[PDB]
Every structure is written in structure tokens, then in C-alpha cells.
Structure 1
Amino acid sequence: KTLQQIDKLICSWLKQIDNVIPQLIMEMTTETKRHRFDLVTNVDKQIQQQFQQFLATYFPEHQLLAENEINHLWIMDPIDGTANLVKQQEDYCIILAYFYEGKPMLSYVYDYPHKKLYKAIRGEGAFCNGIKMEEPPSLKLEDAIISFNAQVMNLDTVQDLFDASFSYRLVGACGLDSMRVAKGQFGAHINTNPKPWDIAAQFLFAELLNLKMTTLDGKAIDHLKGAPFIISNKACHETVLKILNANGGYQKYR
């Protein structure tokens, strides 16, 4: 009811990042700083600062989980698809997810480069540039195209996943690979090691569209934590898990 309010403000914010990204892309560099393995840039740090400030201006009580039992929580990946941002300047996205007392309420994956807004509102629907998304038609794995990082599983399980499925594509940002699943464009997407902000938005998309979104053990995921994960068409979920979990695991070593 006042979700309409919060949506109006988020949309105002996403619209104005338009006029802040191209200057940040043109003056772009990388930092290794404050990070074990992952790459960060000046773009995402700024979009974050910008969203923290949005939170300060409008929702002084709301808290930001970004780079337990709190009532108003936002989880943000200012730039999902960092390698893509740096190397291609395409196929990155901004992910925001809103949780009221642990229940997902609003979600956003904004594909800036292609100008596409995915949003999920509880009690309204899921939306892609204001056109309503519905439950994708049933996809069985041999009919489905799937998406995963192939450098990160033993080469043997990659080859079963190749064989069980129609084909293989990779976009390289969780949010974007996940949305393709949501649109019926892919059968499933797998991330073996997600950060919370990499997957946060997809809970609500998954719920409203009847997607299967689980850990790779098939168990339900804690949105504050994140585990190795799959978002899938309901018709190829069990087949994917089953392949991933055969012959002592999909892990790359041993």
C-alpha cells in the first residue's frame, strides 16, 4: 500500500543514476582494496554511496546490507557483473532487494546497458519495463539452455551438464543470468559461491514466477548469508541438482 511509495522513490533513484554512470564509466578505475579475491571499481562504490544517501534522505530507519532480525533491510549489489563492467561495459546490473521482517517485498535488477528494469513487487507482480512477467513455460533440461561458470566445477560434471541440456550460454552477471531464467530464456542458472547481494533480488522473482530457487543440496536459502545456489525452471530443477550431485560432487578439486 505504501510499497507504492517506496517503489516510486526507488524508480526515481534508478532514473537519476542514468546521469551519473557515464561520467563514472569515462573516469573509471579498479581497486583491489578491502577485498580478498573480488574486483571493485569507483563506479560501484559511488552507486553505493549514492544509495546509502537515498536511504538517509528518505528511510532513516532502513538498514543496508552491502559491501540479523532487523525489520527494514535493503540488500544491494551496486554493480553485479564487475568483470563485465570493466572488460565490456555491458552485462552488468544494479541489484536491490527489500525485506520487511525477513519477507521479500520489493526487488530490482536494473540492466542499465540495455535499459531494462526488472522489478518484483509483492501483491502486484514481476515486471520487465512495465510488461508483466508470468511463470515461464515448462522447460525440461534437454530443451533448456543453461548457464553456469564452467571454470569452477570439475570438467566431468560440466560435460554431463552439456549432455543433459539443449545448450550452454553465459552472460556473466548473476542478476542477468538469473533474469533469463525468470523470462524462460534459460532453463537454469547456477552460482556455486554467491555473495548475498548476488542473489538477494531473486527470492521474490522466484516466488512470484514459480521458479525453483534453492541451495545445490535443494534446501532453502537464508537471504542474509547465501550458499551455492540454483534458480531454475521448475521443470528442470531436480535434473540439474541430480547431475550436479552425482559421482561425489561438482567441486573442481578432488
Structure 2
Amino acid sequence: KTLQQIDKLICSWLKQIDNVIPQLIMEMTTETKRHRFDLVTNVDKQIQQQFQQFLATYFPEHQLLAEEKSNAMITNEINHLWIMDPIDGTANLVKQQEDYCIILAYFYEGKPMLSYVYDYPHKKLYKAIRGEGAFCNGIKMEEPPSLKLEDAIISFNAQVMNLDTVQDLFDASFSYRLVGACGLDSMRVAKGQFGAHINTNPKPWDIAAQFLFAELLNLKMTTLDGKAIDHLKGAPFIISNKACHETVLKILNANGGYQKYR
């Protein structure tokens, strides 16, 4: 069926994008979408429009669900779907020129088959391939050791939570860190550097690649109620070492839950 051949083409596209991003940065251009903190650049747009055109030339029947376009349009009954976040970490890109990524994920009959989180700034490509595994620049990633929460660093956006449940999380974990790109905080979970990453209101594209990684590396990836996540619509989600999953959810839901209140 081979996914290995499709992988080869995706990786070849990613090498071509390597040479293209420098000139996009060279003529960078910033705009805001819904508020002053919601950024898009020509980089985002151009990376996306280019995969779209790659998809049309090499995979004309395949559909695309991507951040910087209408997804009117995508439905529950579609055989070949690619979910794309062309730059996950746009705020990092613009403000830092560091700690953003490209997220790509291919779904066959709803089932994740290929996934890509490309940390362009560090030249590290994490990929996952149903049947072969998950890799970082080609070296095989393995299931990470067990981490109990009290031993684990954790990552979440603390601005978007009430401070009571932020505190309970600080008190229950080893320490707290933030990269600020869902892709990259998730890959830190995947490598056992963090015990868990939480995003309370992610988009489909912000989490699309992670499903396959979570599956192949024996991580947990769920709603904040422990349920399967619909990959088409987002959901408040968590990616977690298996040893600290229930505990984080329990804390998040305790005492009336994690939502702001003021």
C-alpha cells in the first residue's frame, strides 16, 4: 500500500521547504487575525499554499484541512485527509525566530497513518509511520520511561486557567516549563523530557500529528475528560506519559475544574 513511498515524497517536500523558508523570512510580513495576539505571516500562508499545490500535483484526490484557509468543506466521511499547521508557534516565529514547527498528519479512513512535526529552527524532523515507528532525523524514538507527576516537568498555558488549578499543578509536579508551540511541547512529552502537555483550546491542526506519536510510543492522548479526541474538530486535550495521565486529569477537573471564573 506502501506508506514508505509516501513518506519519501513528504520528506523530499520538507527538504525543498528548508531552502524556501529563508527567503520567506527574508521578506517576512506580519498580520493579525482575531486579536493583536493572533498572528499570521507570509511564511504560514506560503508553506501551506505550497503543500496544497504539492498535494494537487501528487495526490489530487486527497483533501486538506489547514489553519490559514476555509475548511467549510471537510466532512466526517473522507478517505484521504491531510491536516496541516504550516507554522505552529507563529507567535514564537515572529517574536523569537525560534521554537516554531510545521505539523502535518495524514489520515486514511479516519485512521492516522503518517505524522510530521518539523522543528525547522533546530533542523529536527520528528516523524511517525504506521508499521515502521517514530523517528527523529531517522533515529528510532522509543517509548519513554515511566514518569509519575511528582517526578515530571509539565507544560501548559497558565494564562488561560484559573490560578487555583495552576497552583495545584505546580504543587503536584516536579517543575513547570513552556515552549509555546503545541507541536514542540508535545514532542518533549514524546521524548520523556516532559511528563505531559496540556492545551485547553487547541485547533485540529495544533494537535493533528500527535495522535500517531501517542499511539506508537505508548503515550496517552485524550480530551480533558479522558475520551477519544475527534481529529476533525479540536478539543481541550492532553498528551501524557502513561504514568501521570489520570493524575493530571484528576487535578484539572477537581474543585470545580480548570476554567477561568474571572
The normalised TM-score by structure 2 is 0.94
**Retained in 1: the 8 A contact 2:222–2:228?**
yes
- Measure how far apart 1:4 and its partner are: 1.2
Q: Distance in 1 between matches of 2:166 and 2:93?
A: 26
Q: Distance in 2 between matches of 1:30 and 1:2?
A: 40
Question: CA offsets, 1:6-26, max 9 Å, x none?
Answer: 101100000011111111112
- Measure how far apart 1:38 and its partner are: 2.7
- Measure how far apart 1:33 and its partner are: 4.6
Question: CA offsets, 1:91-150, max 9 Å, x none?
Answer: 000000000000000000000000000000000001111111111100000100000001
**Retained in 1: the 8 A contact 2:37–2:91?**
no
- Measure how far apart 1:34 and its partner are: 7.5
- Measure how far apart 1:31 and its partner are: 1.8
- Measure how far apart 1:29 and its partner are: 1.5
Q: Flag structure 2 segments of 5+ consecutive residues without an equivalent.
A: 66-75
Q: Match for residue 11 of structure 1?
A: 11
SS at structure 2 position matched to 1:113: helix
What do you get for the CA RMSD once the two structures are aligned?
Answer: 1.3
Q: How many residues end up aligned between the 2 structures?
A: 252
**Retained in 1: the 8 A contact 2:32–2:39?**
yes
- Measure how far apart 1:155 and its partner are: 0.6
**Retained in 1: the 8 A contact 2:151–2:173?**
yes
- Measure how far apart 1:37 and its partner are: 6.7
Q: Does 1:35 align with 2:35?
A: yes
Question: CA offsets, 1:45-92, max 9 Å, x none?
Answer: 000010001001100110000xx2100000000000010000001100
Task: Report which stretch shifted further, 20-29 or 108-117.
Answer: 20-29
- Measure how far apart 1:32 and its partner are: 2.4
The normalised TM-score by structure 1 is 0.97
Name the CA shift for 1:209/1:55 in 2 (closer, same or farther; >3 Å): same
Q: Identity of counterpart residues, as a percentage?
A: 100
Match among 132, 157, 162 for residue 165 of structure 2: 157
Q: Distance in 2 between matches of 1:54 and 1:181?
A: 31
Question: CA offsets, 1:137-193, max 9 Å, x none?
Answer: 000001000000011100111111001000011000000000000000000000000
Name the CA shift for 1:184/1:154 in 2 (closer, same or farther; >3 Å): same
Q: Distance in 1 between matches of 2:161 and 2:180?
A: 16
SS at structure 2 position matched to 1:15: helix
Which runs of at least 4 in structure 1 moved beyond 6 Å after TM superposition? 34-37
